[model samples]
Structures are given as structure tokens and as C-alpha cells.
Target: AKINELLRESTTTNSNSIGRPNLVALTRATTKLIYSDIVATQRTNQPVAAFYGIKYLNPDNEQITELTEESKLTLNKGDLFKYNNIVYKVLEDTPFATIEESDLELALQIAIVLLKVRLFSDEIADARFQINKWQTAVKSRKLKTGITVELAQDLEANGFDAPNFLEDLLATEMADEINKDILQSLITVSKRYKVTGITDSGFIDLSYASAPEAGRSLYRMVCEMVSHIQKESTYTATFCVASARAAAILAASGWLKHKPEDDKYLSQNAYGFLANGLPLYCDTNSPLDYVIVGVVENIGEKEIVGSIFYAPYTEGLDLDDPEHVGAFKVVVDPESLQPSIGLLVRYALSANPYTVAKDEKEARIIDGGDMDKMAGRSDLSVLLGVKLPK
Candidate 1:
């Protein structure tokens, strides 16, 4: 069945590639959407807390006074009993089945095997046998158990090659053809566990079931927000610089803050400022012009001293065009200065800001110096220069 799916997917992609670029692109996009959903689901399902430090201890009767902590439990060698209210033991060499940790590990191993099936969509007959061995290990409280013995016999008699089987599936003639499709299917399956959407603006939306899910959702939200903003504007002139500012504004103004759990509206807190929040320096009426631009010139211990450009709506002018009105720059006076702008931008961009002049034609240089002075000040200037009447 897996082989059939692979073949079909390969044939479809190949056929689409030759006749319809749009359809091919759509297929690829949908596949990506599916894959993202699965990844998001996995992230959401990840455990938030973990337990560790389970060990066996021998009380030598040498006045070992400080071994009564609840987090730390101790047991005698060859003694099968409860410690810290959990069942465990100390053994020279116990079968895997005797150890609870071993059982959990086996379960994880089975999960990994299932993941492989999901990843490649290839039927491996021996994964079940391996899983059974782990299950036996869990029940017998011995490192080796009946299931392990059976698994060993099958491995020795049948010459089972799980690794080779995987390699073969990966190396088959149809592997490349079906690999992407299998991944897409896995992603599609993941979407059943979460909120997934592919926006018309060529961006994906994913809401997850956990904190990690929330993190992933935030990431997708930010990416899609930037993509959507870029699609609506032609400021190929500013690119990421302008878009980032717009994103920050939109984020602050409660545009991208979608609360899936509450079904209620929640506004985003003021994180930081963008250099070119709006379009041009002097466009109050333009919708693009009110994008709130600013510069974090100097950050003091107690106050944030950055310039925020504001353009209140001017009367009767096209909001799309920046040349229609005027923009004003004001100092942003935040109530508290706990996290600095540099730190916020660092957290947001996850990279260093690129330094460059806003516009070469305009005489407005950063810090009133030549473009060379602006070379290292990319994060300091709002790229808002007006075109004077020529």
C-alpha cells in the first residue's frame, strides 16, 4: 500500500511538472502546508517536564546520614522493592523487561519506528517484532524476556535487516518520487490535531495544543504576517527593513495577535519600534504612512530615549501613496526600560541588523554624516525620505 502511494505521488508530480506549473506549485505548496502541520503537532505534543536521576544505592551502614531526600531514592543490590514510592531495583544484570525505564525506552523506540513508517510510507514487517520485544522487556522485569527471545530467534533465523530495509526504501528508484508525497501525507495527518490553514497570501497558519505549539504558532504567525504585508506593498525599496517595522506596528496594534483558546481579542504589548514604520517621511494620509517609525538612539538605565515618527490621518488623500502628507518624529517615552531596544531587536531578528543608508539621492544622512557613518547604523534610522518637487 505504501509502495502504491509512493508510485502514485511520483507520477502525479512528474505529470504536473511537465504540463502545469501553477498546479505543480500548488501541489508543492499544499505539501508544505501539510508538513508544517505535522511538525507543529509534534512540537505541541513534546513533554514539558521530565524526570531524571533514578538510581540504585547501597547503604554501607557507615553512617551515611544524608540519603533521605524524596527526589533521590535508594535501593539495595538484588532487592526488588519500592523507593521514593516508585518501583525499582538494583541488579548485576537484569533483563530489559525488569526495568521500567527500559520499557519507556522501548516504547520510544516503537514510536521512532512508527515515525519512520510515517516518513517513508514503506512497510517494514519486522518493526512489529522489535516493538513486541520491548513490550516483553517491560512485562518480565528482566533485561531479556520471552518477546526478546522471539525477536532474537526471528532476527537470527530470518536474517531480518531493519537498517538495510530502510536504506533500500530510501534508495529505491521510486524513493525520490514518493518521498515528498509521503512527507506531505504525514503533515496532512498532523493537521487533524491542530488548527491549520494556507492563506491566499501564500502563507501558512498553524495553532498548536501546547506551549511549544504556541511558540511554533507565533513563528508561523510572524512569518505569514511579514509575507502578507510584503505582498500588499511595493516598497521593494525598503524590503525587510520596512516590512519588519510594519510587522511590529501590526503586532502592537493587535492585528496578528490571534488568540485561539479564548475566542477573545487580545492586544499585543509594545515590544519595540521600527525604523520605517510608515512609508515616506511626509505622508500623513497614506495608510502606509502611519506605520510608526523610530530609532533607538540611546538607551539609558531608566528610560528608553528613541525617536518615534507619527503621522496622524491627514484629510482627503490616498493612503497608499506616501507623497501625499507629512510625517513627524517624536521621542518615544516608555514607562519602563527593562529590556532595551537592541535586545528586543536581537530577540526578534535573531540576527544582526544590516547597516545602510536610507536613500542615497536624499541629502538626509544618518547622524548628519555621509553614508559611511550610516554603514554601521542600519538599526538606527527610519528609512523615510521625501522626494522634493523637482
Candidate 2:
């Protein structure tokens, strides 16, 4: 209450009314609840968010679980290992997983360390539960929690990204959650099955003159990704992540199955494909025309969801009451920081023309829709239509 009432000291977001979308997004980027790794922290001195990095480690060859202290450990020629539940083995006398020389990559390693646990997918699915800040959701006693890093203090101290890191974490999380909902499990696509052709210059060609082929191309994504990481099997997590637009494009390929909007009529329709059971999900926040694939089972840590562990970039907002003037609200869920590198394959969605559009002038002419289109290329119509997956 004091925070809201302290308004006379904060900037009034709506006070300007020039259509406060900008203000809304900034506030939204403030907190999206897609953060938790920090909770694993120690009363130990708080770590600086912008600085610090993950002395990340490597998991065992047979380990099929999320990253955690008991997860398991092993080493390879290029292995980057998390050790002592605190530091990385690579950054050691002989750092194997070379600590990237770049400042951003170095900073990213740290953010990837926090919340080395299962994702909040289960929580978001529970209709009866209302989420709160700092709450944690751990995967069941499936095989007992064997994590890699446990010095909640050291680990979290080195975890988190800069500038609304939590938002980025949420996007990663939401990406994972959506995959959970839509994918039966993750399966990889093989080269033979991969029809996604790249331009001579190695660029994607989104001109899917045939939508069906585009649909098949998406399926290839699942197959290739699944097989690439781990063997294609029942336990594999088969899922695809598409910018909401890309999902719609594949759906238009007349492959995906969708159910009526209502709960009672739930069944697969021709909205999305279910190749060998892998399901497709939409994340508007995901990059456009980008295709990412992963396995829920054996996906290399970075590819699977939540690999990029995150904490609140800032514990809470502080104000110089004397200079504050207005109130605050929520918007973008904090601008998520980048760098959960690895298995994060981003390729062109389709060289064939099969992507979905959100709406109007933006769809064909506006700068927002799929800005990939040219304004001078004849009159445009809205190809944007679809009830995106939640």
C-alpha cells in the first residue's frame, strides 16, 4: 500500500495520456513472475545483478534430468562443468567449457545458474492456484532431485541477467510451458526429413508456394531437433517454438489440429500438426520466422526450456520519495536479458510462404505485423488470422 500511496513521489504513467503503451510496456517489463532461481539464494551477501557470471558445469553422459546439484558430473574435451555446487570446473586450472571471452556471454553464464530446477509449467497449469513472488516449483521425486549447483547462495549470487532479466526469464519459461502444453514430448528431425532449404547465401526462403510443404517442414524441425540431441523415442519431449506468427503459418499449411475454443469441444482440428505426436506452440515474444526445436527428455540444457535460469534483476523498486510523483503497474514482465546459449537453434521458419499474421495494415503494410513484407510490393491484405495458443 505504501508503494502505491507513495505515488506523489513517482512518475504518473497515465498522467501523460499520449496512449501510454510505452509506459505500459516499461511497467510490464517490471515483473512477470517468471523468476525464482534467486529464492535458492543464501542469506549470504546479495550478488550484484548486472555483474557476476555462471561458472557453469557439465552434466553426466547419462543424466536426463534438469540442471541441479545432484544432477551428475562428467568431463569432455570441450566440457564446461559446474562444480562444488558453486563454481564452474572450466574456469578452473583448466576451464573446459571455455568461459566465453565476451562480456555478455560471461554475464549470461551467471543468469543461467539461478533456479536450476524444473520449470513452473505445472504451476501455471493448475487452475486453482494463484502465483506469488519467490515461490518455487520442483519436479516430483521422479528420481530424487540431483542438481548440479546447490550453494543457493553462490549459485544465485552469480545468476540473473541485466535490465528486467526476469522478463527474459519468463519468456524462456513461457516458451517452455507452451511447449509442454502443445508437445506430446520432444522428437528431433533428421536431414533426410528436413525440407527447409536455405538460399545460396545460406539464408531462408519464406516463399512456401505450397502451405502443405511448409507444414511438413515444421514437422522436420521436430524430427531433426529430436534426433540431433538424443535418440528419437517415446520419452523424448517433442515440441516446436514459433513466433505466434510462425505457428499460424504452419497451421495454414493445413497440417496442425486445433479444437474449438470452448473447453467441452477439445480435440485436434486442422490447426496444427501432431507429427508422430510432437505438438507446436506459439510464443509471440519468440523471434519471427524463427524455428527452434528441442527435446523435453535429452535436450542439451540450453535448448530445453528454463535452461536460462533467472532471478529478479532488482529485488524490489526503491524510490526517493521526495522526488517521486506517481504510481506503478505491470506490463512486459521485465525485459528478459539474453544468453542462455546452446541447442538454441534459430533457423528460418519456411522458405515457402507459410507464416501467420496477427492482423491488419500491420499484416501486410504496417511496420508491426510481419515487417518482412515490402510496402511497395502491390496492395496488401491481411494474412494474419488465428486464435493463438495461450
Candidate 3:
């Protein structure tokens, strides 16, 4: 009896990973299947006694007619059923039940708009400067620091710790590398819309391209596309902008699950900028697939790291390039320590475009598992792993 109990428990625990739900749901389904089989066998006068200790059967060829009939009745009655400590209740009226597919799609489209408004609203709350205000201040020489420094000071004064302020600042600056004007414009527009959490420093640079003309540029185009999708298609638009090579690394690293394997213009192999090289290709006809690559100084930390590569747009094209387009600089924050050389080496291997035998060999070595230890090193690990979810 003890062995049979153990076997039963084990049989109830196995589950499919991608089929949705968890162990509990899977176990319940298995139990129901097993119970139906046993009841059918008993009714048929089969060898129930011989199978008493067995946990499972090869085919379990029991018809679930009784259970199906009962389920139908219960569903019709709108009653709840309890099985394996889980309660399943059917709702009489569902939000989507009466809607046509096209209407549902429209509702989803509206939902995206609402979500973008909310997200932009949140960005406004966190925004440091309105473009007009900044323009006035800069023009009047009232602003105390560079746009980046002023933004950092605002964040610091608003209660951000030194480290968090620096990290956020870095992220914002990196994001702005593509289009400072858009970053600034977002802050302005967000303020007009009462959005929060965005800053002028977080805007993308659009000087690289003009409005309609700039739409033909890649980096500018991608930002516009992402913004449109967030506003028009879905509310959940979490984007990671990187050079073609970096984008490939991000995709290959399994960080993004639904990324398209092939982009509109560049294949995974041909996409990316040469180290310290200029813009390679621009499709004036379809700006959404534009790309730009340039060498820039790594601005996140100290330690004299070599030049870093940046891509401006992965979605759309801009009309003009900003003065800082393809510009590089050193990491500025005092709090940031030198990152592990191994981490930098790994990123370099993955993010940089390949050229010759030396580059290829270096990339192969990193891809071959030379830097696995540095992969999981992140500041959020301690908080994410131990405290926040609790």
C-alpha cells in the first residue's frame, strides 16, 4: 500500500512545460484521467484487483463520457467544481465572448493606446525637463550643468541613491545616443500628456535626419516604429536597441523571445557596423529598415575600456544625423567600478561586427564558452533573487 501510494504520487507529479499551468494543474488532469479509467474498468468487471498497485496504464483506454456529461451539466448550471484542491468556476458572461474577432482586434488596438498613454504618463512623472523649459534655461544660461548632468542632479535630488541614479542615467544616455531630440521631445510631449519617468536626456537624437526625410533613416525609423506600435498596436513595447551585431547577440542570448529571426533589410550575419566605421547602408525607400554603426567611448564606467560600438535604429529611418551621431566617449559616473574584463571581452565578442581572421577567431573563442561565469553577473540579482518577489 505504501509503495502504491508512492507510485500514485509520482504519477500525479509529471507535467508538460509548454502546455500552460504548473505541476498542480497537470497533476489534477492526470488524476482525473486515471480516475475515469479506473471507474470504467470497475464497471466493465475488468482485472481491477490485479491493477490495484499499478500507478498508470499504457493507453488508459477509458471513455470520459460520464465526466464529460457531468462537466456539461455543471457548465450549463454555472456551478463550481473542486478537484485536487483547485476550484474551477465558469463565468456566465465573458468580456470577449460576445465580441467579433475584428471588434476584439480593435479593442486590443485601443488597449495598446491606453497602455502607451499610461506608460507615457508614467514617464512624464519621472521626467526632469520639458523641452521648452530646457530650451529656455539653456538659452538663458540658467541651467547649471550639461543636459546629462542636470538630469542626474534632478534624479539625485528626487531621492535616487547614487548608484541607482548612475545606472538609470547610463541607460537613459545610452538610449539617447540614437536620438537626443526624440528623447527630449518625448519628455516634452510626455509633460504635455502628463506622462512621467522620462527625461530630456532619454530622448533619441533626430538631427541625423529630418522629419519625413529622416523617416527613411534606420535608427530614427525604428524608434518611431516602436513608439507607434506601443501607441497603436499594443501597450507592451519593451524594446532593446543595439547595433545589428548587438541585436543579434541579444536575440541569440535568449533575452528576447519573440524577436524576428530576419529583419527587413539585413540578415543576421550581415547586420552590424564595422568597429569605428561609418554608416554602411541606408534605404531611402523603406526607412523602417535603416541601420547605422559607429564607434563611441564606453560611458558607463571607468578603467579605460576600448571604444564601444552603437547602432541608432533598428526599426525606422530618420532624416538627419545628430552632431553626436557615431560619437564615442568614456563612462563618466564616479560610482561605476571597472566592469570585469571578462564581461567586456564577452560583450565585445558578441556585439562587434566581424571583419577578418583575427576577429572571427576571437568571436569563436568567446562563443565557445570562454566567459560563462560573467553571464549572470548583474546588480539586480541580489534584489530580484532574494527580496522583491517576496
Candidate 4:
């Protein structure tokens, strides 16, 4: 049994680089073929790449069957397929779900109204097809289409005004995306702290540590990073965030199966956990192997400042051609204000660690083998290894 277990361990992996969800958008006809293949293989109980732990949802989004160690299958406008934990929605033939004459009429009206306002960024997307830019309307204002006064009012309320409004709207989107990138960066960086007690291996090995005690490895990793933070800086960290995968692994390993009752700490949005008596939270965006731990107070000043600038639209170069009729051109030169619009964001993300246990080092990429020594910290935030096999 010992030899057998070791052999299995060699083949199995705690790393989830492959298990991470990926979105594969496919056409309706192609999606149908894939679903039929899935059904045929599942009926015969044959092993195939398409049959690998896949699951499906019907048109109503109900699961085809309950999941177990073995589970598998769909073909409809709203059908869904799950492969490797990623849920993919089935593509429909048309941009709108109904695709009936009336629904198509409505979509066309909405498309025309958006184009009339010169909202170039707003384009209709079809899952199975590329964008519809309302080329006919863009080419000529004479192109007739249905219009709704209520929708026009709605658009204005939602910042449909051409020049300044679109610029600010794009700026907000850019800022939010930038902030998301910052959180991702912080999580990635925090997962590289050196293990204090063990240096040669670069990781505090919890694999040989005794198990069966609830949250044993979790507690050790959390407390180690916390103590390190406290030693380097006077700030005491009391917050934690683990990846959804990491949390699932901990749950699977029974590390988080038991918890001390601390009702007051629990909130509507966040489940309370006493990670060494500190409040711990979780996020799906965090990376595997490491859970982020840090001082909550350090994020008070974190913010992204933004500014929106706009340039008036100009006539297109090819004036006579119907394709270029009413065409607009805006250069992207900042000094000349030539770009149709611009939004500059100053990212002053204030969430940095108050203490520095390790000096600034080049960003390192870890292979699966290097994961054994992987641990994660900063003054305000740190990463603690929580490797668990799914």
C-alpha cells in the first residue's frame, strides 16, 4: 500500500494549472455536433477526450444529472456545457435570443438608435458571429429603422451623449479594469515570500506534518506570515483572502471542515473564519497554492484617480463613397487632441505591505516542480501556501 500510494502521488498533482477554467466560444452548428458526440459516448460508457468529466445543462439551465465521481452532457440557445469546471454557454444563430421578426425588429431599432448617437463603442455581439456595426446606418443617415423615444431617454440617462459622455464612460471602464489588474498583481507578488525557519528548501514543508487536526496546515501558514509581518512592522495583520480553488482544496482536505463559533464576526457578504483568531475572507480571483494574508488597515488610502478628455468628431477622408458617407475620423494624438476621445487614469493603489521581510526581487515564474518550495508576504499583505489536491 505504501509503494502504491507513492506511485499514485507521483502521477497526481496538487497544482491546478490545467484545471483552471477556460472559455471556448463555438458556433451553433459546431456546438450541436459536440453535444451529440458527448451523448453518444456517454450512452455507450466509452472513454473519450470529449467524455472527460464533462457535464451539461439543458435549455432551462438544469443539470442533466447529479454529479459524482463520474458525471457527463446539451443543444439549445441557452444550453450550457461544463468542462474542467468552466461553464460555456451555447451559441445561438442570431444576436438576439428570440430571433423572431418582432425581436429582430426591436434589436434593429436599438442598434439604429445607438448608431444615431454615434456610440461607436456600442456594437451588437452574436455568440456565434462577429459584431454588427450597423454599417448601413453608419454609411448613410438616410437608412430607415424603428426608433423608441423611451429608449432614447434611457440612453441619455445612461450617458449616451456622444463626445464627453462616451469619454467618461470609457474612462470608468478603464479605471475599473486597472484596479482589477492591481489586485491580481498584488496576489501574484504576495505568493513569493521566503520561509523564515527553512531557507534552503525555500518553503515550509507541511506535507510531513501530522494531519487529522482541523486547519493544521492552514493555521501554521497563516500564523507564520502574520508573525513575520508583525516582527517586521508593528502592524498586526487580521485579514485573509484565499482563491476559490485554494478554499475548495482546503475543504476537500478537511482543513476547513471544522471552525470555532464566532457569530459576531460573520457578515452578510463575508463568512467569518478565525484564521489564528484573525478574520479570513476569500475571493475567486486569488491564485492557487497561496492564500493572501495581511493588515486590513493598510488599504484605507488605496484608490485610482481618473480624468476624461474628448475631441470633436471630424468628417471621414472618403467623402463621396456611400461606404464612407458621414464617416468620422479622430486621430489619437494626445498633444493635438486628435483622438476621438481619451481617458487617462493615475493608479495610486495604496495597498502595499507596511513591512518588508524580503527585498525587492525580479518577478519569478514557478514550474510545477518548484511549487513544493512555494510560500507567499509583504508588510500589509502576504501569501501563505495552502496547496491541496482537488
Better structure of 1 and 4 per lDDT: 4
lDDT of 4 by residue, 1-390 (tens): 211221222232221222211101111111222111001111111111111111111222346222222221123444443332224343442222332334433543452344321112214632321111000001111111122223323445665346233323332344234334334544644544566555226444444454534546666666777776665544466556666655544533534432456455443223345545565454555555567665533223321110100111112212222121111111122343222222222212211221121222311222111212221323346765554443
lDDT tens digits, residues 178-278, model 1? 22332222221111111144232223222222321223333333343333332322111221121233333323343333232353322221223222222
Q: Write the per-residue lDDT of candidate 2 for residues 1-390, one digit (tens) a residue.
A: 221221222233323333333223333432232112211111111232111111111324412233332332333222343322223322223221343434433433553453221112211321221111121111111111121212222334455534434324333443344233222111111111222443232333344433335456545544555554333222344444455556665544555555323543322322344444555445554334554443332233321121111222221323321111112222211222421211111111100011122232333332211224321111000111122222
Best by lDDT: 4
Q: Over the full model, what C-alpha lDDT does candidate 4 score relative to the true structure?
A: 0.33
Error of 1 at 343 (Å): 47
- Mark the regions of model 4 whose C-alpha exceeds 4 Å error after superposition: 1-179, 188-193, 196-200, 205-213, 248-271, 298-347, 350-377
For each candidate in the order shown, give its overall lDDT on alpha carbons. 0.23, 0.29, 0.23, 0.33
Give the candidates in order of TM-score, highest first.
4, 2, 3, 1
TM-score of 2: 0.29
**lDDT (tens digit, per residue) of candidate 3 on 260-349:** 334433223122432221112211222121122111122233211111111121111111321111111122333325321000000111
Between prediction 1 and prediction 3, which has the larger TM-score?
Answer: 3
> What global local distance difference test value does model 2 have?
0.29
TM-scores across all candidates?
Answer: 0.14, 0.29, 0.17, 0.33
Candidate 1 lDDT for residue 333: 19
In model 3, the worst 10-residue window by lDDT is 132-141
